[PDB]
Ligand SMILES: CCCCNC(=O)c1cc(S(N)(=O)=O)c(Cl)cc1SCCc1ccccc1
Ligand SMILES: CCCCNC(=O)c1cc(S(N)(=O)=O)c(Cl)cc1SCCc1ccccc1
Ligand SMILES: [Zn+2]
């Protein structure tokens with residue numbers, strides 16, 4: 001499978017034709033204020049330099065594989081472990097966030113993928129309610145350089161070739177996300193890639209994260225994908241809510 | 252294991268000492284109104300008179316086995332099939348509901364136990380979040396005989412001995428539940444019996460169902476339990492919310 005053409009995702013995984021797919025257009029107007037939604041709690045995200053983490057050009061994104069010990073709670077009794085993070089981005093002044101807000105696409109998006117503590121493996125969790133949870137943040141153009149993002153972006157050069165990887169030092173993974181853990185949208189959706197399994201709890205932060213133009217350019221212009229093609233516009237088209245209600249943690 | 256006697260439950264099933272157990276004290280004023288909670292959908296619940304259904308004294312409750320085909324939705328793509336229903340009740344002047352509202356215990360409680368359609372078997376769903384869903388309604392005293400409940404309470408005679416069972420005509424299962432399916436409390440919790448597995452989505456109807464004082468009496472005073480002693484007070488004490496916010500479908 002690939003972005004921008006065949007093989008039609010459904011022929012790959014039938015679940016890519018489910019009613020309740022991701023990503024979606026967030027309309028904060030139509031969101032439901034749900035005061036049950038307490039602030040997110042991350043444990044063990046402040047990693048030391050050793051051991052090193054694998055960073056991979058898998059042809060679809062750049063993926064940072066995360067070690068055991070990153071614990072995430074969406075609430076009391078809603079416990080997850082981080083597996084990996086990856087990025088979706090566009091090209092030169094064409095934005096590439098997967099989620100949009102009142103139809104606005106942001107320059108790029110980060111996903112931190114998590115497995116419910118009730119499952120030993122991802123393949124058991126696919127399609128199961130709340131089996132995976134994604135924490136999602138938009139990246140916008142800002143004046144300053146994001147020093148946290150610079151540690152990953154300075155290594156893209158080394159994995160330019162599709163299917164290539166490198167080892168990088170541990171870092172503050174929670175410094176790749178916004179500081180406001182209390183203001184977010186939450187909804188039930190799917191993977192945005194095949195096999196597109198449903199049952200995924202998406203949390204999407206109100207606050208964005210700022211990268212410099214050089215940084216956004218480095219993300220969009222450095223990696224190569226399937227064929228002699230640049231790895232760009234690595235986002236799926238927005239999917240109708242089909243009667244899902246997005247919750248908001250704030251009025 | 253037994254109700255009222257011994258042994259401490261955490262000694263049969265350490266899971267009974269989890270942080271996120273059921274049943275709980277509902278405080279409607281501390282509940283969080285979430286507009287995302289849609290009306291419950293129950294299809295296939297109007298059973299014909301044949302086939303007949305197994306009704307069984309299992310020593311802990313009276314339990315009706317439900318056939319395949321009772322489909323239930325808590326929200327879009329969040330579907331369930333009904334397995335069984337059973338009751339909790341008090342005795343001669345003591346109320347015996349499991350859930351309580353602002354401390355008030357009601358005479359009795361009906362639990363309709365469902366399996367998520369994302370799992371083939373109950374044993375796979377146990378401990379998984381949303382794996383099992385219970386529809387719970389308080390039974391209280393009113394002036395009229397309840398036609399729906401009479402179909403069950405009149406057959407208790409024939410199964411008074413622990414372990415005895417009987418076949419009963421098909422009935423309308425939706426007729427044992429309250430009037431307004433848009434009005435409920437919901438929280439994540441546990442089985443209220445061993446093994447006290449967590450991940451159970453509890454939905455408690457705001458509105459109650461009315462049984463004649465004769466009928467409650469038939470329910471509390473007909474059945475024989477473990478030993479040469481009566482099947483009565485078959486409820487678990489209220490359990491702490493431990494940070495869990497009970498949600499409401501209504502302001
Ligand atoms: C086979 C590699 C495909 C690349 N996709 C993902 O890494 C991926 C993306 C998302 S997203 N964009 O919804 O946030 C999510 Cl939630 C998970 C994964 S990978 C884990 C899921 C999976 C299991 C088995 C095969 C393929 C994917
Ligand atoms: C072995 C004792 C059986 C008595 N309890 C139940 O049938 C039962 C009660 C509840 S409750 N009060 O939370 O609604 C629920 Cl949600 C399920 C069951 S039976 C299905 C789960 C189970 C599997 C294996 C052993 C025991 C229970
Ligand atoms: Zn993604």
Ligand SMILES: [Zn+2]
Pocket residue numbers: 337338339362443
């Ligand atoms: Zn019960």
